[PDB]
Design a protein around this ligand. Structure first.
Ligand SMILES: Nc1ncnc2c1ncn2[C@@H]1O[C@H](C[S@+](CC[C@H]([NH3+])C(=O)[O-])CC(=O)[O-])[C@@H](O)[C@H]1O
Ligand SMILES: Nc1ncnc2c1ncn2[C@@H]1O[C@H](C[S@+](CC[C@H]([NH3+])C(=O)[O-])CC(=O)[O-])[C@@H](O)[C@H]1O
Lengths: 230, 231
């Protein structure tokens, strides 16, 4: 699997047909941004792809002097992402950076989004990234962490695999040329349970976290840094 | 409780009222249909408990392709039953529906491949909820499923507050306050006694369910699926 030009071309339709609840989570990210993005601060869209989460945050910022930093290590994604974000006017500028989220600093951040990105790192790298995000968020800041989950209960995992299978069938996933290769990707991805995600978030320092969305085997957590945090 | 009544006024506006106030509701109705396609077995019954106008019933009914099933839709509101009868009568399908005016606390659950409590258990007194779940587990056939969808409470007050505010913002975005019923509906929500996800899971385990999981959530609303072991 590579996030190449072909993937960047079909990405919005690929993700729509394969991630149950994706558009709801994009909407939820924007709603959160209205309440959590602070004046004069930064928001990070980590593994931004074509910038869908970036643009949903950006439409919901009504403060001056914010900036969104959208980062992805796929050159094809970045090229399309920069052009795509340039198509829409807003007062908040976006820095679209080709780079690795394992390396980038998190500074003066009121919000950070990992919208189906952490799953692409090696499992052993996940904690360091979440630790870095917690440290770089300002007090009162929020992280949104959306993932495909695994399930400890194998019978429940099977049911949710089947539901995902039926969802893809209902949405004509197999019409897409990329669908076999995407399925091959998902078959080798290493996903964590909700409990595992909550534990890492706690370990990184987040004083409050919770699952705020789920649909079958996909979902999203929101984690808040306390307003009185050190 | 309070001054809330499920009268003809509420029955008229119900679909719009729920759409503007329950995040995820239509997604949960679609998921119930998807589950029915896999779980509703030939020659068995499905129960829609607290059916209101039949939305969950009809989603199940459209996803049964066996010729010898039956859906039993039960509600104790005369207004909601009267409109539910007429609403279900508007749509053709092979599976018949028995629309029964009655109390879910009293109804027997027999030969059931699937039971739905789609925003209904929250209306019982907390002390009555286990008995209903126990009865549903016992009445499910092996391999059967329960869908239990609720507004949830949250132990972490900061999280509870965030999800309250998100629900507030969702209602604003969807023009909830345009509805005449909105203030009375909010009053109802303000007196209903909701449980946490962990509390629901504990009742389901205590009833006998060998497998349960949250399979949907959106802000402070969501749904659990509980499976009875096969054999
Ligand atoms: N180490 C890395 N560093 C930077 N980018 C990375 C890295 N590893 C993978 N990527 C990038 O992570 C993104 C994941 S897609 C995110 C969807 C988007 N957030 C959305 O809300 O539409 C979801 C998916 O493909 O399922 C891809 O664009 C990768 O190039
Ligand atoms: N003891 C009871 N016995 C029978 N019915 C009852 C009882 N108590 C309350 N009800 C009925 O439970 C239903 C709850 S609505 C269900 C939505 C539907 N399932 C849907 O998927 O659209 C959700 C809402 O009003 O928030 C009402 O019609 C009550 O009359």
């Amino acid at each position: 699997w590579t996030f190449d030009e072909r993937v960047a071309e079909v990405f919005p339709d690929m993700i729509q047909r394969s991630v149950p609840g994706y558009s709801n989570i994009i909407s939820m990210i924007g709603m959160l941004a209205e309440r959590f993005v602070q004046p004069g601060t930064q928001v990070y869209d980590l593994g931004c792809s074509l910038g869908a989460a970036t643009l949903s945050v950006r439409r919901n910022i009504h403060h001056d002097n914010c900036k969104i930093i959208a980062i992805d290590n796929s050159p094809a994604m970045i090229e399309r992402c920069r052009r795509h974000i340039d198509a829409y006017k807003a007062p908040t500028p976006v820095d679209v950076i080709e780079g690795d989220i394992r390396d980038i600093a998190i500074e003066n951040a009121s919000m950070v989004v990992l919208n189906f990105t952490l799953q692409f790192l090696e499992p052993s790298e996940r904690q360091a990234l979440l630790d870095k995000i917690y440290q770089g968020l300002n007090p009162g800041g929020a992280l949104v962490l959306s993932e495909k989950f695994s399930f400890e209960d194998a019978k429940v995992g099977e049911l949710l695999f089947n539901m995902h299978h039926d969802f893809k069938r209902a949405n004509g996933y197999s019409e897409l040329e990329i669908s076999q290769k995407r399925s091959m990707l998902e078959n080798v991805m290493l996903t964590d349970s909700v409990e595992t995600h909550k534990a890492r978030l706690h370990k990184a320092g987040f004083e409050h976290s919770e699952l705020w969305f789920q649909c079958f085997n996909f979902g999203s957590l929101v984690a808040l840094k306390a307003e009185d945090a050190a």
